[PDB]
Design a protein around this ligand. Structure first.
Ligand code: NA
Length: 129
C-alpha cells in the first residue's frame, strides 16, 4: 500500500508515534517519505546481505527474520514480511523499539540525511489531525 502523506500521518499518530522519544510526527512522516516513498511494500538490499523492509525500512540484521541474513537478530520477534503489510501496526511497534535502541532516529539514514535539522512540521501541514 502506498499511503498518502496525511493518511500516513493520521495512522502514525493513532499508533502513538507523535512525540515518541521526543520525535514530533513530522519527523516520522519525513522519514517514511525518504526511506520508502510511503510504500509499505518497499524492500532494499544492504551490502552486508541484510535487507530493509517496509514503510520505515527496518533492517533484518537486527529487527526481523527474513531467513537469509545469517547470524542476525530478530529483536522485534517478527518475520520481515510482516513489515510489508498494509497494516502498519508491526512497523510502528518495531520502530518504537528501534528509536529506543540508543541512537534515536539516527537509525534511519534517510531521516538523518534528509529530515534531521529541517522544518519537519511541513510534512504534516494541511493535515486534519
Ligand atoms: Na534477522
Amino acid at each position: 500500500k502506498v499511503f498518502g502523506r496525511c493518511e500516513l500521518a493520521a495512522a502514525m499518530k493513532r499508533h502513538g508515534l507523535d512525540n515518541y522519544r521526543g520525535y514530533s510526527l513530522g519527523n516520522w512522516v519525513c522519514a517514511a517519505k525518504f526511506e520508502s516513498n510511503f510504500n509499505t511494500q518497499a524492500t532494499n538490499r544492504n551490502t552486508d546481505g541484510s535487507t530493509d523492509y517496509g514503510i520505515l525500512q527496518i533492517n533484518s540484521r537486527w529487527w526481523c527474520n527474513d531467513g537469509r541474513t545469517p547470524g542476525s537478530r530478530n529483536l522485534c520477534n517478527i518475520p520481515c514480511s510482516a513489515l510489508l503489510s498494509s497494516d502498519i501496526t508491526a512497523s510502528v511497534n518495531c520502530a518504537k523499539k528501534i528509536v529506543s535502541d540508543g541512537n534515536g532516529m539516527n537509525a534511519w539514514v534517510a531521516w538523518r540525511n534528509r529530515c534531521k535539522g529541517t522544518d519537519v512540521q511541513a510534512w504534516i501541514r494541511g493535515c486534519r489531525l
